Amino acid sequence: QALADTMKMTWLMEGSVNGHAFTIEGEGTGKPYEGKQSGTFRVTKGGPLPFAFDIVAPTLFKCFMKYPADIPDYFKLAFPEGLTYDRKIAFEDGGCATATVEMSLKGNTLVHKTNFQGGNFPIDGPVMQKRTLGWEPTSEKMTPCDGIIKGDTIMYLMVEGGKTLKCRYENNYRANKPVLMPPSHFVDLRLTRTNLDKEGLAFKLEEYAVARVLEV
Amino acid sequence: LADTMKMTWLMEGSVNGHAFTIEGEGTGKPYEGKQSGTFRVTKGGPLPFAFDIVAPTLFKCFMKYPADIPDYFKLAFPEGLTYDRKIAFEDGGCATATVEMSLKGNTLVHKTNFQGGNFPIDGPVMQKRTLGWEPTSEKMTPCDGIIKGDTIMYLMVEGGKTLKCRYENNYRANKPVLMPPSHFVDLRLTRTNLDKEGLAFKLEEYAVARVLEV
């Protein structure tokens, strides 16, 4: 196994949203084969953020998924060499972002590095007014194509006052020269945000993700 | 709805300025989530575009639901349900459709107006190089008495290629009904050609609901 039953992780995310630069650093622990992970994050530059931390939380780790033995796990098979992915994030109100993530392995630690560029968020929208309340669970479609996995998801961001904001993710997960691909499948996931202060400089995230094929 | 129902379809529209009409008749088992129909292009045929782009718009009351999840689409009957749909292909082809589903005796009546445009002249849709839709799962999200349907579906293309499509659906029951929680509906839609000219087709679908266990 390139990945052990328990792994440590680190995150470094740099970017800008509506021209506001920021840096987030994190450390965590996860169980790759159980599909569980958690981490503690700090906004080390540009905090308190003028935008909802929720917009970067799903971009803060695809090798943490529970797969049945009869479905190849592209994200773990990518290790030890690692995986890089690009991501398009599009909200229904015109807010958008593009991110590039590199996942690498250093001993017992999985290293996650991201550059996140966001723009066109409405000034009075829930993201810039920080009126969000975490993401509703959803299912990511995983479609193999030309040695990459295309991830496609519709995810709703919860908003204060019983409202929601729809978001579409288009992900392209690229391992180096893969020779085994899974069939098309889905990965169900729940991402929970825990605030660690009142100011918005520290957060904890937890995720559970599990793969399945449709029975149709 | 009875265990077995008859259905009729009337779809009128235009794609890249080309007008067409499709009529169909079929039978299904609403509670088993199974349906099939035979379709004929009665005006504007042979179509200059792939029949596959209208096939997912040709019937939400045919879904297998477990007893502990309310079935919005069946609870909408006998009053019926109307929905709007946005269809967006990754190459810029797009369509908007409005579907009215009604009940008249033992027959479910499906009426659609489908407007499509901006399909690339050399793309798989206008070159009729498609091979049916890959199965997928539709997200169903209740919102103020309606169900928002959201799906990413891949259309198979000759030569081992695909064309991604996004559907954004708004299902509106004609009378308020008990609402389900957010869930997904897995489905497989199969097309079978009934002729060589492209005037007749058979479609079949199996759809089954699931709540996530996360």
Numbering used by the authors:
A (entry chain A): 6 to 65, 69 to 224
B (entry chain D): 8 to 65, 69 to 224
Sentences from the paper on this structure:
Anthozoan chromoproteins are highly pigmented, diversely coloured and readily produced in recombinant expression systems. Here, high-resolution X-ray crystal structures of four open-source chromoproteins, gfasPurple, amilCP, spisPink and eforRed, are presented. Like GFP, chromoprotein monomers have a β-barrel structure that contains a chromophore, which is autocatalytically constructed from adjacent X–tyrosine–glycine residues encoded within the protein sequence itself.
